[PDB]
Design a protein around this ligand. Structure first.
Ligand code: HEM
Ligand code: HEM
Ligand SMILES: CCCCCCCCCCCC(=O)O
Ligand SMILES: CCCCCCCCCCCC(=O)O
Lengths: 393, 393
């Protein structure tokens, strides 16, 4: 317990642009005690260096499961135990039930369908000459893809969106509480309706049959929490990827022109976007399961640790000229998806969605431009991006 | 125990060029029960898929501590417990002793010296007009860099090399163990020469003080074995990266000419070598501590797992047109340094050692060329490289 820097006190220059602070801090060291901005201005360690971001993602002394300390956060209570709030051996078991669904091989078999979705959205959007890229394009593609994968297409997406939006960028203690208890219910309703059809040849179908079987493979509260995460992690991350993409592209016409000149560079741009504006700014819940250290810095048992994945993406030791967006940038290991046991299950899917989305849009909009200012940034440290992206072509 | 892909049945073809075989296996699936080529032909699961390689490296069910199942290899007993034969918490305790020395900040401080060393090696070497690159350049640089770092002042480099070479590629039973004891003699005596000397501020200094202040933080057995791993891992890998690098460039003249023409590309180029001819072909000892699955293949408890890193580097689904060497390659996440708790401690160092070496040399030898046939490949699944590389300039 000592000198805290309150990130609130940087105002909203820091929400809009966290990097010159991240940098300032990274020069002073790799790890520092921090109160995050309001609302729900949380405190604990922030990791801002790559090498330490990487290594703390792998450190077996960091836990994600607070019930081992007697604490029991909301999402745990109302959703259940899910992938990001458990450690091995339960992590392993729950993970094994869904890994085969999300391999490169299987994800590639969705290409034609993701392409077809993208074509219909651009068809629908193009003729009106201008729009919110999010409502019109970048939201519906992932939320349609993930609902089809599960599969549950007649879902109320708008209720879903708003609940999902709240739980990843909480506006306050009550709203948060409300949305969690509202989504728990919605999910309970959803699962039952899926149980009430029979021949569900799909991951949630498979998942409901697994729970019903009297192995501890999958509990009822785990089944709810699985679908919570599959649906939510699919959604805001990928919307933001696609949107941060186009946004940074159009704020860097050098590179965009470079890219249209040679569309083989496309995938290398996506990787630069993921480095430079990675949709997950700050990694999810971790605390010290024992006394340990990260820099020279002693972290005591109990302290939370927050790994700055976007902070690491602009480490100059790892990424020379970190504040420059270069497609032709030298192979450039980032941490946008994590590392270690909880490395993103959706990475191949995300990469596919985002690549197909961005190619098709750029092919079908030679004159795409901003028009003009982008919408509100959600609150909290989890998500990096904007809710509305007004665009024209 | 079931079907065995005997890797020996392929002959010297495989040892020379394993990639077409890896590709044939990977096309069937990503994991296979194998028999390593002779000598001391060994059985286990070889992982040949990128996605499965990453997961396996992070999987908490694989152990590297054979003692936990009543089995002691020549390295463990004779050298001691060191970083690649322990799991957490022993691993966590040992790695803490040394992480601070191998950081990016600290490594970069060595750039003047590594350069100075690279130049001394080239000034001496360049007038003779031709040389074995290994004896004259690639070997001495890493063995010098690491020795200073420790710092073991004057080293018998001709003896150490032979010992080290043998334990990293064993030729037979009698030679292997002999090398371990002959090497276990030298380290002990290297350790005591340091013990019997004026205390100064370097890693071995700090290590030996820790041994003396024993609260099980560092046992003398572990002290030998730490000095073992750092000297040995420091040397084979880096020599082989420098060598693999020069040789791949000279067998691919367009790409070299592209690099000669634009030396900013060097770094991408180096990362492409690591992907294409990674010095560590197959990662070190791992076994299943409980029964598991890897690509939907059932792994019994006790089965060895061999994670094929170079195999992963030619995986079509992670790297398109994998058997093309492309200085301009894009998104290209490889696994040449591992992943998870045991990720290379020395990667920023290796990258630095290699980059200096390749630049200085390429800048001072504009008509560098092969002359003619390269040396023999050592045996075993650990090292991918040749042991004598004759060049001219
Ligand atoms: C589009 C960009 C995406 C990014 C940047 C991203 C990023 C991440 C990150 C950083 C984590 C780990 C965070 C931590 O360790 O605390 C993660 C985990 C996860 N992601 Fe994603 N993700 C993306 C897309 C997806 C998609 C499409 C899905 C599902 C369809 C998904 C499902 C998950 C799941 C289930 C986890 C938890 C894994 C575990 O604990 O074992 N992600 N993602
Ligand atoms: C030149 C290229 C290098 C490559 C490709 C390389 C590769 C690797 C790989 C793949 C591992 C993990 C193997 C496994 O999980 O079984 C590893 C571990 C290690 N490497 Fe390297 N390495 C290199 C250079 C170095 C250097 C220069 C040093 C020391 C100065 C070093 C020290 C280590 C150590 C100490 C470990 C063990 C880490 C642990 O168990 O926690 N390496 N390296
Ligand atoms: C500061 C907000 C943290 C809230 C933790 C719960 C979020 C669950 C959704 C995770 C999505 C993802 O990991 O990509
Ligand atoms: C199964 C392989 C075990 C080999 C034991 C020898 C250890 C040599 C250390 C080199 C480690 C590395 O560079 O990855």
């Amino acid at each position: 317990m000592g000198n805290v820097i309150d990130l609130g006190e940087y105002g909203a220059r820091f929400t809009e642009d966290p990097y010159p602070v991240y940098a300032e801090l990274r020069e002073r060291g790799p790890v520092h005690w921090v109160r995050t901005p309001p609302p729900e201005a949380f405190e604990g360690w922030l990791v801002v260096g790559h090498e330490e971001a990487r290594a703390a993602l792998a450190d077996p002394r960091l836990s994600k499961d607070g019930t081992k300390k007697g604490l029991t956060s909301l999402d745990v209570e109302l959703m259940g135990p899910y992938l990001l709030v458990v450690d091995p051996p339960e992590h392993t078991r729950l993970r094994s039930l869904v890994a085969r669904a999300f391999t490169m091989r299987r994800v590639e078999a969705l290409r034609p369908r993701i392409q077809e979705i993208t074509d219909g959205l651009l068809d629908e959007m193009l003729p009106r000459g201008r729009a919110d890229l999010v409502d019109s394009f970048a939201y519906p593609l992932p939320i349609t893809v993930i609902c089809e994968l599960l599969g549950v297409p007649d879902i109320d997406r708008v209720t879903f969106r708003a609940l999902s939006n709240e739980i990843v960028a909480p506006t306050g203690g009550d709203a948060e509480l409300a949305a969690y208890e509202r989504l728990a219910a919605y999910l309970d309703e959803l699962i039952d309706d899926k149980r009430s059809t029979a021949p569900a040849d799909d991951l949630l179908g498979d998942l409901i049959r697994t729970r019903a079987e009297d192995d501890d493979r999958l509990s009822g509260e785990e089944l709810r929490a699985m679908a919570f995460i599959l649906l939510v992690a699919g959604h805001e991350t990928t919307v933001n990827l696609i949107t941060n993409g186009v946004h940074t592209l159009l704020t860097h016409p050098d590179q965009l022109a470079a890219l249209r000149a040679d569309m083989t560079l496309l995938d290398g741009a996506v990787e630069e976007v993921l480095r430079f504006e990675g949709p997950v700014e700050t990694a999810t819940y971790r605390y010290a399961a024992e006394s340990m250290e990260i820099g020279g810095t002693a972290i005591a048992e109990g302290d939370p640790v927050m790994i700055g994945l976007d902070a690491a993406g602009r480490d100059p030791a790892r990424h020379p000229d970190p504040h420059v967006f270069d497609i032709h940038r030298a192979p450039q290991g980032h941490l946008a998806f994590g590392h270690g046991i909880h490395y993103c299950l959706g990475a191949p899917l995300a990469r596919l969605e985002a690549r197909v989305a961005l190619r098709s849009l750029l092919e079908r909009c030679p004159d795409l431009a901003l028009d003009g200012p982008p919408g509100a940034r959600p609150p909290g440290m989890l998500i990096r991006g904007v809710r509305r992206l007004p665009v024209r072509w």
